[model samples]
Target: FTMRLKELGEFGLIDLIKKTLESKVIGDDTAPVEYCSKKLLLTTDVLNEGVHFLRSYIPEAVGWKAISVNVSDVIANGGLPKWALISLNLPEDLEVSYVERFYIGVKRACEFYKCEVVGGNISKSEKIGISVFLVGETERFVGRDGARLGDSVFVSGTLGDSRAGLELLLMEKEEYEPFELALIQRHLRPTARIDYVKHIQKYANASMDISDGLVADANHLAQRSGVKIEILSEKLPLSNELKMYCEKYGKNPIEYALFGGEDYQLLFTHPKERWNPFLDMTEIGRVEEGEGVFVDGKKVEPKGWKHF
Candidate 1:
C-alpha cells in the first residue's frame, strides 16, 4: 500500500479521507451530539483550482461556490446551516483582488442562506484552493442511509446545466446565446437547495445533495441506505437550456441529467402519503428493497465522475 501521495491531489485526498471515515465512523456522528436540546450537524468539503474549477472562473463565484456546495449537504439532510470555517490556499503570485472577490461571494452566499462564516485558515501553496467546514442544526435530520422501501424519490430542479457549463468552458463555445451563457454561470455559481430543504424537511425520509453526478450520487444514497433506487429517465426534469445544448452537441439530455456533475441539488425520498406536502418536488423515482439505481425501467450501469 506504499504509493505516491502526489497522485492524490486535494480532491483525491478529500475523497480518500471521506471514504476512510465513512468506513470507520458509524452512526450519526457527522453532527455534534446534542446537549440539552440543540442538535448540530457538521460536514466539510474541499475545492481546488484546475480540478474543481477552471482558471477563468470568477474568483467571487469560486468563493461563493466553495461555501454553498457544503451548505447544500446540510440542507439535503433537513438541517439549517449555521456556521462555516474557510480554509484557503494561495499561491505566492495570487492577487489580493481575487481573494477579496472570493470572500465577497462567500459573504453573499452566507447572507442568502442565513449562515455564518465564523473563520478558517490561510496558507501559502503552489496552487490556489479552498475548503469549508459547515455546521447546521435540525431537530430531526434526514440521512442518505435512512430511505425506506417504497419511499418515493424526488429531486429539485433540472440537471446537466452545470455540466453543460463546464463543456462550454472547455470547448470555449463563443457562439452561445445570452441564456446559454447564463447556464455556464449557473455551473460556476450553483444554487444550493437550502430553501427546498427547509420546505420539505418534515416529509423527506432520506436525502443528500447531488455532487458527483446523478447516477453516482444516487448510487451513494442507495448503497448507504441499503435500498434500491428506480429512476425514470423520462421523468427526470431537464431545463430547456440543457436540452437545447445537448441537442446542439448530439448528446442525450438525459445523460447529463443522469451523469452530469456539480448539480448541488437535493435528492430525497419520502413516503408516498407525504407527497402532498412536497408539491414543490418533481417525482423522479422510488426506493425499493434491493440495491442500485435503475434508469428507464432498466438496470443502469453506474458511471461515477472520473477524475482522470
Candidate 2:
C-alpha cells in the first residue's frame, strides 16, 4: 500500500484512503451517524500557522474561522451544530493572552452558531495549530451524492469577496478604508450559512459549502453525484466591494469567484421542477447529464487548496 504521493495527488489519495479503509462514508466532508431518531453530523478542520494563517491574523479571527469552517460543513449537510472539540498545538513561547482572545472568539462563534465548546486538548509544537471537531444533529441530511439530473445548481450570497480580501491582505498595504475593511473582514470572519439550512433541508437535493473554491468544489459535487455541472461565467455573483477593488486593481472578479476558496457560501442543488423563489440564492449553474464540470463551455481543472 505504498506509492509516490506526487503521482497520487490529493484526490487520488482520497480514493486510496477510502479503498484501504473500505469506508462507506468517506466521500463527503461531513460524516453522519444515526442516533436517537436523528442523524449526528460530524466534521473536522485544521488550521496551521505558516500555511493556513499568517501573523497578521488576530487570535480572535483565527478562532472564529476555525469554528466557522466546521460549522459550515454541518449546516451544509442539513444539521444544526451542537458541540465542538477544540484542540491546539501551540509553540511554547506563545503568549497566554493569545489563547484567551482565541477562546473569546471561539465562545462568541459558538454562541452565534448555537454550539458549545465541550472539551479539547493542547500540546507543545514548533508552530501553532488549531483543530476543531464539530458535532451537529438533524432529522434530515443532504449530501454531495444526492444531486440528480435536471437539478439547478445555486450558491448563496456573493462570491470572491474573501479571495479578494486575501489578495489585499497579501499586499500588506496600509490604510484599509471602509470597503477594504469589509473585504478583509469577509476573509477573516466568514459566515457558515446558518440561516439557510432550512432551504437546504427542504429543497436541496445535494449541498456542500464552498471551501475549495467554486469551480473545484463543483467538480467534487459532479464527481460524487455522477452528473455534469455547467457554471455560467456571467452568473457568478460578485459584490460591489469586490467589483470596486477589482476595478481599482484591474483584477478579474470572475477569477476570484471561480477559484477563490473560503467563501463559506452554500453551494447546493435543487430540482428545477420544484424550485421556489423563497431561496435567497443565485442560480449559478445546472446539473446536466454527463460527466465532469465545465465553466462557460470550458473544462475546469480543480486546482485548489490541498496538502499533498
Candidate 3:
C-alpha cells in the first residue's frame, strides 16, 4: 500500500517523518546544540535545478542563493553563521565553466557572511542539486515558540519584490524600468539579514524568516506560540517599486505582499513596550488570545509555497 506524497504535502510529509525520528529536536529554523559551553545552531537547505532556480539562470546567482537561504535560517535563530559544508549533484555533461561560476558565487556569499566552506561532496545526477549545511554560534538563541499574547508583530524590509521579480521573468517581460530591474535583482540575489540577529536577540520574543510567504510563516509562529496573529493588511511593508509595479500591471499589491513567497525578510514579535517608533521595523499586528491567523480583522486561508 504505497501512499502519494502529493496528498500529504511538504509539511504533512515532514510531520510523518517526525513521527519516525527518535530525536525530539524538530521544527524551528535551526537546531540548537551545545558545544564547548556555547550554543551552536545547525541548519540545512537544498536547492534543485528547475525547482528552486532555473538552469538558464546565472550559475553564480544560483550558487549564491543556495548558500543565502541556509544562512537565513541561522540568522532567524539569532546566530552568526561561521561554517558550511556543501554537497553538489550535477549532470555528467554539465559545463566546467558553469561549475566554476557557481563556486565563485558561493565563495562570495560565504565571505560576505564570514562563513567558511569547510568541505563538500560531488556526485553525478540528472539535474543540478545543491545542499548546504550551515553552523553558527549564539549566546542567546531565539525560537519559534516564544511569542506572547500581547507581543506586537513586526517585519523587516519590504515584501513582494522577489515574487514580482519572479513573475516578471516567468511572463518573459524583458523591458524594465530602473525600479523593475531592481525587483528582478531582488529575485536573483537576496541578502540574509544576519546583521539584525543581535537586535532580535535583544528585543524580539520570537522570529522567523519569510521564505514561505508572510501568511504561512506567520501562521507557523502563531501555532507554535499558541496564540493568534492578526495582521493589519494596510500596514504590510510594501516597497515603492512593488507598489508601482502592481499598479502598472493592475494587480493587487496587498495580495502579493501577503501571499508572495521567497521574500527572505524577517518576521518577528516583540513586546509592545520594546518596540521603538524610530526603528526600521514595521509593526503589522498583534498576538492575541486566540488561534489561527487573521488579516485586517478577517480570517484568511493560509496560502504559500507547498512542495507538493
Candidate 4:
C-alpha cells in the first residue's frame, strides 16, 4: 500500500526506511593514479538568498557558508582546495557592513583551509547572490566512477545534525538560548569535511561530499561509478543536538540527514579490508553490482535532489 505521508510524520517515515534497509561493506580500487593520471580539477557553485540561504540568515555567516560549501565539493573529489574566485550581486539597499562581514568570513575560511583567494568580478542586481569558483589538486585523484562492486561505503561524522539544527532554529525561533542557537549558527557557518579528503584519500576508492542529502548524493556516486549502493538506515550517525531535537520535535532525524541539502560531509567507498584499518570511519553500507541506490533493503524509488 502507498502510505500516506501526512500520517507517517518524520519518525514514522524513518521507521519505514529502517525496515527496508540493511548495512554492509563492499568494493575496492588500487588507486586512481595507480590506475590512471590527471591531477588538476575545477568546480563552480553559486548561492542565493532564497535558494541557498534564507534572507533571515545572518549576512556574515552567509559569506562563510558561501565559500565553505564550494570547498566541500572540491574536497569530496579527493582534492586540496587551493584557490577561489568570488563574485557578488548586490541590491540598492544592501549594507556595506554586510559585504564587509561577508568578506571577513571568507578571509577566515581561507585562512582556516589554507586556500588562496585568487581574483574575480562583481555586479549589482535587484537581489543578493554570491558565486564562487574553486580550484583544487590531488596527488592521485579519486572520482565517483572509480567505485566498484564489493566496495565498502563510509560517511564521516554524524549525518542529521545540520538539518536538525536548522529545524530547531525554525521551530523555536527566538525562544532558544545561546547554545541552542548554535544549531542555527551551524546553518550559517557550515564547514566542509576537507580533513577527510586529506586523511582518507589513501584508502578511498570513490568519494564525494554530501551537499544534497545522502539518498540523492549516494545514488549519484553509484550511478557515476556504475555500481549499486546499499545503506542501512539505522547505521547513520546523529549529533547530540539532532538526537534531542528529534525527541522533542517528534521528527525522525534520519530523514533530514538523508535528505538535508547542505550538511557538506564526505561519503566515500573503499575495499572492506582497507576500510577495516580506517575503523574511525563509520561503516553504514556497501556497493554492489546493480543499477541504482538502495536504502536499507528496499530500492529507493526516486533518487537525488530534484529542483521540482
Candidate 5:
C-alpha cells in the first residue's frame, strides 16, 4: 500500500523525518551551534513560486519576504541575524530586470537588519524559488518548551491583515480603499519582529513566530511546554483596518485573527511579574496547567495554515 504525502501533513512529515533521523533535537526554529566560545543560531526557509508566493506579486516584495521569514525564525530563537546565504532557482526566460529587482529587495532587508550576504548559488528551474540560510548569535536562546503556569501570553503587532490582503488580491476586488490597499501591501511585504529579540531574550519563557496562525502556533507552544494556553477572544490584537474591513464585508474579525496566517509577528509567553518588559506588546491570554489551547473557556480547533 502506498500513502500520499498529503495524508501525512506537514507536522506528520516532520515527525517522520525526525523518527528516521533519530536525532536528539529536530523541531526547533533554529539549531544552536557553539563555536569559538559563542553560540550561533542557524535556520533556513524555502519559498516556491506558486505555493509560497504568486508570480504576479512584486518581485522585490517576494525577495524581501523570502529573507524576512527566515529572519523571523532567527528572532524567535532569541538571536539577531548576522549573515545569510541565498540560493535562487529561476527559469531561463526570466527577465534580468526582475532578477535585479529581486536582489534589490533582498539587499533592502539585509540593510534593515544589518545582515550580510556572504555567499549563495543560482540554478535553473521551471518555477522560480528561493532558499535562504541565515546565521546569527545570542548569549541565550528561547524555545517553545519553557512556558510555566501563570505566564502571560503576548503577541506583537496585529493579525489577519496579510490573510485579508491575500484574499483581496485573489478576488481582484475592484476599487480598493486605502485601508484595503494597506492590507494588500501587508500581505506582499511583512516585517520580521527582530526588534523584540532583546525583550524576548530577557523576559520570554517561550517564543515563536505567528506564521501558522495564532491558534496553531499557540498549540505548538502549549504542547512543547506541557501547558494549556487560554486565549481571550475579546483581547486578540486586531488592527482597526481589519476591523473596518470585517465590518464592511460582514466577516468575523476574531476568526481572521485566530486562524489567518503569515502575520510574521512574535507570540511569546512570559512571567506575569515580568510584564513591564513587554509594555509594547498586547496580552491576549495566559498559561495554565493543562493540555491544548482554549479560547473563552472553550477548546479551540486548529484551523491555521496546513502544508499537505
Candidate 6:
C-alpha cells in the first residue's frame, strides 16, 4: 500500500485517517459530545491565505468568513454557538491595521452569534493562516446520516450567489453596479443560519450546511443515509442578483446553483408528515430508497468545487 499521497487526494486522505483511527465522529459535520445536560457540537475550520483567499481581499471579511463557516456547521446541527478559539499564523511584514480590522470582523460576527473568543495560539508563517475551533450547544445533534426514505429535502436561502460573487471578485474590476456589489458582499461576508435553528431542530430529521455545492453535498447526505437524492433542476432557488448576473454574463443560473460552493445554507430532510411550508425554506428534492444523487432523473458526477 505504499503510494504517493497525491493519489489519495484530500478526501481520500481523510478516509485513510478515519480508518487509521477508527473514528466514530469523523463523518458528521461536527463532533457531538455530551456536555453536562446538553450536547456540544465541536468543529474546527482552517483558512489559509493563498489557499482560501487573496491578500487583495478585505481582511475584515476574511475574519468574518472564518467564524461564519465554523458556526454554520453548528447551526446545521441545530445548535447555538457558545464559544470559539481563534488560532492565527501571521507573516512578519503584515500590517497591524490589517489584523485590527480582521479582529473587528471577528468581534462583530461573535457578537451577532453570541459566541465568545475564549483562547487561541499565534504563530509566524510566510502567509496568513486562520483556524477557528467553535463549540455549540444543542439538545439533539441533527446529522447527515439520518435521512429516511420518502423524506422531503429542503434548502435554506438561495444558492450559487457566493460562487458568482467569487467569480466577480476575481474579475478585478475597480467599480461594480449595485447588484454586482451585493453579489460580491454575499461572497465576502456570508451569514450562518442562526435564526433558523429552531425550524431545523423541530422539523429536520437529517441536516448539514451547503459549504460545497448542492449536487455534491446532496450526494454526501445520500451516501451517509443510504438513500437516493433526486433534485429537481427547476426547483433550485435563485436570488434576483444571481439571475441578473447570469443573464448579463451569459451564465446558467441553474448551473451556478448546482455547482457553486460556500453558500452556507442549511440542507435538511423532513418526513412528509412533519414538513411544513410555513418556514422560510424551499423544497428542491426528495429522498428515495436507492443510492447516489441525481438531477432530473439522470445521475450526474459530483463536479463541485473540490480542494484536491
Candidate 3 global CA lDDT score: 0.90
lDDT of 5 by residue, 1-308 (tens): 79888887889888888889996566778888888787799999888888888877789998888889999999997999999999999999999998899889999999998898898999999999899999989888898889989999999899989899888888876669999998988888898999898888998999989998999999989998999999999989889899888988899989999999999998899876776544468899999999989999899898799878
1-308: candidate 3 lDDT, tens digit per residue: 77799877888888878789965778899999988888999999888988888888899998788889999999998999999999999999999999999989999999999898999999999999999999999988898899988899999889999999998888776588898889988898898988788778898899989998999999999988899999999999999999989989999989988999888999999887887565568989999998999999999999998889
Tell me the TM-score of model 5. 0.96
Question: Which residue pairs show collisions in model 2?
Answer: none
TM-score of each: 0.89, 0.96, 0.97, 0.83, 0.96, 0.97
Error of 1 at 259 (Å): 0.3
Please give, for residues 146-221, the per-residue lDDT of candidate 2 as tens digits. 8988899999989989988888889898778788889999999988999888888988899999997998899889
Q: Write candidate 4's Cα lDDT for 1-308 as tens digits.
A: 78677766643564566566641111111112221365655777788867777766667788788788888877877877888999888886888888888888888899888897788888989878899988777886676778878888988877766666666656746588554566666766888777787655687888888766899788768876888899998888877776676777688877877787677778898887775444346888999898787887988764435443
Candidate 3 ranges beyond 4 A from true positions: 276-279
lDDT of 5 at 121: 96
Query: Which ten contiguous residues of candidate 5 have the minimum total lDDT?
Result: 271-280
Question: lDDT: which is higher, 1 or 4?
Answer: 1
User: Compared with the true structure, what per-residue lDDT tens digits does model 6 show for residues 1-308?
Assistant: 78777776777888899999999888878999987998999999878877778887889999899999999999998999999999999998999999999999999999999998898999999989999999999998899999988899999889999998989988999899888999999888999999889888887889999988999888889998999999998999999999999999999999999999998998999876766566568889999898999999999898776677
- List the lowest-lDDT window of 10 residues for candidate 1: 23-32
Assess candidate 5 and give its lDDT.
0.89
Clashes of 5: 0
In TM-score terms, candidate 6 sits at 0.97
Cα RMSD for predicted model 3: 1.3
Quote the lDDT for 297 in model 1.
Answer: 76
Task: Name the 10 consecutive residues with the lowest summed lDDT in model 4.
Answer: 23-32
Off by over 4 Å in 5: 277-279
Model 1 agreement with the true structure over 178-294: per-residue lDDT tens digits: 767878887998878877765556777788888879888888788888999999988889988988887778999988988898988778888867765544567899999998889
